[PDB]
Write a protein that binds this DNA or RNA. Sequence first.
RNA 1: GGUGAAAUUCUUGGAUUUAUUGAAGACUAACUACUGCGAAAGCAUUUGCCAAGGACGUUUUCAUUAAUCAAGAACGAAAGUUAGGGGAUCGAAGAUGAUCAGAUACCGUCGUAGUCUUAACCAUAAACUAUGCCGACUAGGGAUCGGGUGGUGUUUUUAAUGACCCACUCGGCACCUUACGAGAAAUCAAAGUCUUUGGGUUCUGGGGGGAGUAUGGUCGCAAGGCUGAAACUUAAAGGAAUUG
Lengths: 214, 180, 127
Amino acid sequence: VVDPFTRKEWFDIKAPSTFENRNVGKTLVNKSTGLKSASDALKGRVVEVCLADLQGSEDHSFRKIKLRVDEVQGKNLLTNFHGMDFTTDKLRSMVRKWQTLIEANVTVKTSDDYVLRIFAIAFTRKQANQVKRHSYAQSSHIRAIRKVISEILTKEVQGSTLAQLTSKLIPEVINKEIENATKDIFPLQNIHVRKVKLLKQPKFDVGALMALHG
Amino acid sequence: KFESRKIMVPPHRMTPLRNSWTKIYPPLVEHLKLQVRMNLKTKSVELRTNPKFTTDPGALQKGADFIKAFTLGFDLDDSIALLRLDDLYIETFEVKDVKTLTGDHLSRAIGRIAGKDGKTKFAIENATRTRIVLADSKIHILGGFTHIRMARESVVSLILGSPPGKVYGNLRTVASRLKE
Amino acid sequence: SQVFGVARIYASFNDTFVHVTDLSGKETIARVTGGMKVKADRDESSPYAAMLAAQDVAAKCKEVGITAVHVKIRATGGTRTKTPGPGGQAALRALARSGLRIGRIEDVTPVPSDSTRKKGGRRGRRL
RNA sequence: GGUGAAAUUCUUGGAUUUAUUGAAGACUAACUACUGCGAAAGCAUUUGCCAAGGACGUUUUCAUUAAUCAAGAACGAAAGUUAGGGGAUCGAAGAUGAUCAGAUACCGUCGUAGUCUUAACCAUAAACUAUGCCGACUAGGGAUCGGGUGGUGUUUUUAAUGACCCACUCGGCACCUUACGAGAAAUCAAAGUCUUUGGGUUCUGGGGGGAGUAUGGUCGCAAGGCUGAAACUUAAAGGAAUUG
């Protein structure tokens, strides 16, 4: 009988400073050996957590964050932002009959030269005095709106850091900026940035990672 | 301390829920000692365990399943069995899982399950002690585990195209087995 | 303190898996399946077998020291059916009564944008 | 793993399951409807380039230039043929497991050709709205798609535009009620304006079998396509609807 938990060891995960509270929880690894060091088994190891926990506010409950472990010190694992996504039950609740679904996406490089891809979604809605049932839009409108949205996303990136972008997504200010630009074209509802996925990353330095923390 | 569950209601079920509301909460407030509230801001209901007098975690799950079933379209007095009995489950699938068919072929299939005046559906819900709802392409079956499987095999054969009369013959046999 | 794990439940026809891991998902605490707890094949999918599997896993979690657990529920998906069968529902009920604190719950069944061809030929096949 | 039940198969060198990544080929879910486009077959991720088209608007231009159509010609689902590429998935043929069990009675594993694409062929479907094209007239109604006109109307803002509301109008896919009409009846705004029988024009049928056979011709590499009898036999075959 091995009972491997004789050999396992526990570490604490420390989210970056951008988030309101940062004790994520624990993970376990076998005790280190001269043959191979444990710290190499900790590196990578993405963690996925509900944003409503990091912020302590349940209105965020349908959004999820990925964190990737990049550094180890003193049995604390120091970790960096890695992606954002919706929960699947929420997304199914938006799609309904008698309306149009609009999507846009673009790939772009941050000022600290991460390369990422970002997805936006929006839906048409009725005017308050409408009588006809189904609120569809013509294709000339859809192309126009999709062009507008693509422009905004490519200027909100080139924020000075990947961390500055994170500070934009939490208060979801960008949803309001898209709302203002499309105002003239068509009435829209449930404007959301749906997903963010990180494609490539620069040469590592500890300096930036320590600057994000104590 | 605290733990809670939240479940969304689709919009066509919203109005039936309000009309029933006065009948649905008393069993949750009384029998299970849960506390519950309706959140219109996010079109959901939320259920909370009161720490002072709840018995065991089975109370919290029983509450959720009862509300869950109602949003699928089962009647209130059919859903309520999930509080009082303990062996009930829901099975669900959609016709494209069995055979791919699209136009009037698709419409004819679900019409073959209903039968005239629902008589074919009504018969299956009697020869097997179960309840069935048809929501366009999707079928949901409520009952006991062994009963579920007997219902499923019969309805699958209707969408594969067997004539309704032949299936009646099979039901009489299955119903004889459940005389036990 | 709570020390959350995460429980992965995979329900299908023919069998049900119960599986639980560290929050990072790499290290596995315990597994076991319905088929391990019953004699005959025709029973591997039964809800009864699912309850036995869940009770067994929960005991070992307390022994290692996990006290709370997020849960991810999965059906076979792909070209197959997408909603977790009754075997998965039974497992979830049994975990709740174990005294573990259930965290958030999510459905993670894989869905295609649009699929490759389904098995069983043109004339259909009994699911 | 798979079934009604089970066996072939994979696995302590770690199967099934979990995590981080990568490659290939195919497909385009939900939104998706009694909605749109095209001569028909048919057509659904984003952006760019190329050329085409209907309806509307018009106090522009030509001035009978038109309708239908034997010969002749372009296109034509799926499967199929020849040569090159690609080859994830599913899978005629083939090799295999069980042969027990009446609801589940025909199920399991592997897999060639094929499924995708380029260059040439083939010319069939319940290719169906089972309703030939062009023109005129005969009835009531509220919905919807594209264009246009009007409004001292709502909203985006302090204009124009956009979104919406109300009235009218040209064109289109449909729907509900009724029958002065019609019909064998089911039913039908045409299937009406027919013994009170004539607006123009193309194609096809003449009781049931023998038979889409035989023979001749012609097209195709082939599979096959188009055209197509008679001797003889028989008193019915067939359509719609209700009912014992």
